[PDB]
Design a protein around this ligand. Structure first.
Ligand code: CU
Ligand code: CU
Ligand code: ZN
Ligand code: ZN
Lengths: 151, 151
């Protein structure tokens, strides 16, 4: 698949549509998320595309290389570590990310997994407590969706 | 994945959780769908895992082999043709299907695609008309969800 899409939904007002496209040798992520509080929000690909218990059942960050949590520019990061999206004061975050670890086919494929947007900023694994090394202290999951194959 | 899961949601009262498990060259489908009217309801895998327009953006029945619609037991069927699920008086349908055509891996995997439960029963390409060898006259799409990777 060269194109994928994710519709983010939750218990509150946060919603959004994320698009993925395999271009050249990388994946371009675009779209927008609305209803967010102004500022940064963690944005990650979680391991399972399981919504049976809301965003909880999506599990931890997609991490096939068994690394610790980090920022998207770090060597030591989870494949699902796409850092932070930034919402303006209208609560809108425009997503524009190009990432070297995720893919839409094979070992690193995020098709069938879950995209999650968090309540708080991702400290990019530099917070200094154990939690930083797992989730960047990004907190609860405001909205999520299973990543599907798009036309 | 040897396991997948799909959570069906719609605008109406229909909801459900569907489980998939690879066994041999088959996929065992289980779970249940509630909020249905008593009787049969078509149950198909649609091509795209795109919920940007509700269940409509899911596209046609997953048909990578370019065949006409049919029932699961038919040699002439779409890969996505999983027949009907039967709902009882209480509006609950327990799903139990073992299928040899759908797969959770490879070129024609259903992970990242959409499960759809229909309004009317599926005539299995035997109703006579033209909407019978395309959709089996199953009607509107009540609930759907993108098929994701499960633990
Ligand atoms: Cu996350
Ligand atoms: Cu259908
Ligand atoms: Zn992480
Ligand atoms: Zn069909």
């Amino acid at each position: 698949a060269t194109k994928a899409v994710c519709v983010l939904k939750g218990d509150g007002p946060v919603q959004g549509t994320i698009h993925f496209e395999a271009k050249g040798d990388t994946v371009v992520v675009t779209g927008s998320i609305t209803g967010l509080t102004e500022g940064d929000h963690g944005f990650h690909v979680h391991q399972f595309g399981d919504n049976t218990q809301g965003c909880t059942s999506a599990g931890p960050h997609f991490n096939p290389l068994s690394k610790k949590h980090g920022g998207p520019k770090d060597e030591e990061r989870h494949v699902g570590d796409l850092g932070n999206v930034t919402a303006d004061k209208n609560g809108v975050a425009i997503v524009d990310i190009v990432d070297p670890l995720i893919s839409l086919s094979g070992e690193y494929s995020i098709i069938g997994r879950t995209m999650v947007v968090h309540e708080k900023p991702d400290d990019l694994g530099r917070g200094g407590n154990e939690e930083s090394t797992k989730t960047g202290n990004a907190g609860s999951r405001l909205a999520c969706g299973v990543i599907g194959i798009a036309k």
